[PDB]
Antibody, heavy 215, light 218 residues
Framework: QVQLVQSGAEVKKPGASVRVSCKAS????????MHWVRQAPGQGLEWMAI????????SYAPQFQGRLTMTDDTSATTVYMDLSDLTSKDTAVYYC???????????????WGQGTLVTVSSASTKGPSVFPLAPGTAALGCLVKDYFPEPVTVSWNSGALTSGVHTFPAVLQSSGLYSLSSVVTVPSSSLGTQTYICNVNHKPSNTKVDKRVEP | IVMTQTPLSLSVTPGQPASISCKSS???????????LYWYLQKPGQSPQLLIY???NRLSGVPDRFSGSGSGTDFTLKISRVETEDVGVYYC??????????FGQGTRLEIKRTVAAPSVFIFPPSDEQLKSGTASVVCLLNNFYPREAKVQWKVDNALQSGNSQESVTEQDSKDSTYSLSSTLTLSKADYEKHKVYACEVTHQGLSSPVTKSFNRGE
């Protein structure tokens, strides 16, 4: 069983460098090519680099202008990328992926890591402010504003309320902080008796907030 | 080498077939019969997964309703009968020459359904937020189809531009509708200088644009 386990999310300032690792298991590490691919939020896939472990000379997509290096450690069956001189154009999910057997070719990419989010920004890590969106059908919700970086999750009534819930993609504000809303539609009759609490979790800042949304 | 995918978005009634095309700027036929064009599907929140490799070969475990064809520059991915699990973004990828591999821009496959007009709601800023000096006014368009929609913000009947952002949910699996939220941001000072805040929505399922408004301060 192939596994490709990447390191955790990173936050960097412009000008810095980032290292992401990918621990491979379940196959002969040195007999397959390995690839890096990235995806900026809401955008398409971008192929970055390829090597084969233990004696490969990596090669790099030319638009990275030499900022990207790929390495491997065969005794740890791990591949790395180092991307230097970062800008906000480099904010992306970075994927490691196994390519073809070395006797077959370089592609296709049959197994993919879980992805590593790298956020490049001058902003510093910050939990959100949570504000109520107060209401025959009532819409109510929570505005989860001014946090950094992604991601946040939102539940309602500790997960007991799932029907009618819409949690929107975050938007990146000109301040460099994110903002998102989560809404739910409920019967207007229930507003008097039923309680509605949004549970917001911003793991990057270690923040959990509960907000009761009242009429 | 550039790959051009078409259409950018495709809506398919389930059970109907679907076709996606990928055209390369030059032949992907390696001098050996192998043509280096692969297809991937990426579902929301998930890593890409391989579907078709070397033009027409189905990957292990891929259901046989999927097939690919094409010999040099024009490639097509076909789905016998669109099950609703197939919604996502399809990418073609050419790898004729290292390190010049590229992806197409992606075609989004969605479920076709009957037209459904948005239910619109408008939310004032909370008193709590106002204490901090900024005002977020939020407009919600709930459960509509198709995806294309226009939100126009108006403050005392003056058309706003440049001071709002919006985002849209993924297609809901149950009813195949989209939802959209638009946030108008002003400073508390600017907010308190006007009375009527209005969200004007244009959608195909609306014969006339719906406007939802409030007077600041109830």
């Amino acid at each position: 069983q192939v596994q490709l386990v990447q390191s955790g999310a990173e936050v960097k300032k412009p000008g810095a460098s980032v290292r992401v690792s990918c621990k491979a298991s379940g196959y002969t590490f040195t007999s397959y090519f390995m690839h890096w691919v990235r995806q900026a939020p809401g955008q398409g896939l971008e192929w970055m680099a390829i090597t084969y472990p233990g004696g490969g000379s990596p090669s790099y997509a030319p638009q990275f202008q030499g900022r990207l290096t790929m390495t491997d450690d065969t005794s740890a069956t791990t591949v790395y990328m180092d991307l230097s001189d970062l800008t906000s154009k480099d904010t992306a999910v970075y994927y490691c992926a196994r390519g073809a057997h070395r006797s077959i070719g370089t592609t296709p990419l049959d197994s993919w890591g879980q992805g590593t989010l790298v956020t490049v920004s001058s902003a510093s890590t910050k939990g959100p402010s949570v504000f109520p969106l107060a209401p025959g059908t009532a819409a109510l919700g929570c505005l989860v504003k001014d946090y950094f970086p992604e991601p946040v999750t939102v539940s309602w009534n500790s997960g007991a309320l799932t029907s009618g819930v819409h949690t929107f993609p975050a938007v990146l504000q000109s301040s460099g902080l994110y903002s998102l809303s989560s809404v739910v539609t409920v019967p207007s009759s229930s507003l008097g008796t039923q309680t509605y609490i949004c549970n917001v979790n911003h793991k990057p800042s270690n923040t959990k907030v509960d907000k009761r949304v009242e009429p | 080498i550039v790959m051009t995918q078409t259409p950018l978005s495709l809506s398919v009634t389930p059970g109907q077939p679907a076709s996606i095309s990928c055209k390369s700027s030059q032949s992907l036929l390696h001098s050996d019969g192998k043509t280096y064009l692969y297809w991937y599907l990426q579902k929301p929140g998930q890593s890409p997964q391989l579907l078709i490799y070397e033009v027409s070969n189905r990957l292990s475990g891929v259901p046989d309703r999927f097939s690919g064809s094409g010999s040099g520059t024009d490639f097509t991915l076909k789905i016998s009968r669109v099950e609703t699990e197939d919604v996502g973004v399809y990418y073609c990828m050419q790898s004729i020459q290292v390190p010049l591999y590229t992806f197409g821009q992606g075609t989004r496959l969605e479920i076709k359904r009957t037209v459904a007009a948005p239910s619109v709601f408008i939310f004032p800023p909370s008193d709590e937020q106002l204490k901090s000096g900024t005002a977020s006014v939020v407009c919600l368009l709930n459960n509509f189809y198709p995806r294309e929609a226009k939100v126009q913000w108006k403050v005392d009947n003056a058309l706003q531009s440049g001071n709002s952002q919006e985002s849209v949910t993924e297609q809901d699996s149950k009813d195949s509708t989209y939802s959209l939220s638009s946030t108008l941001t002003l400073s508390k000072a600017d907010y308190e200088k006007h009375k009527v805040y209005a969200c004007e929505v244009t959608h195909q399922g609306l014969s006339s644009p719906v406007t939802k408004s409030f007077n600041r301060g109830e």
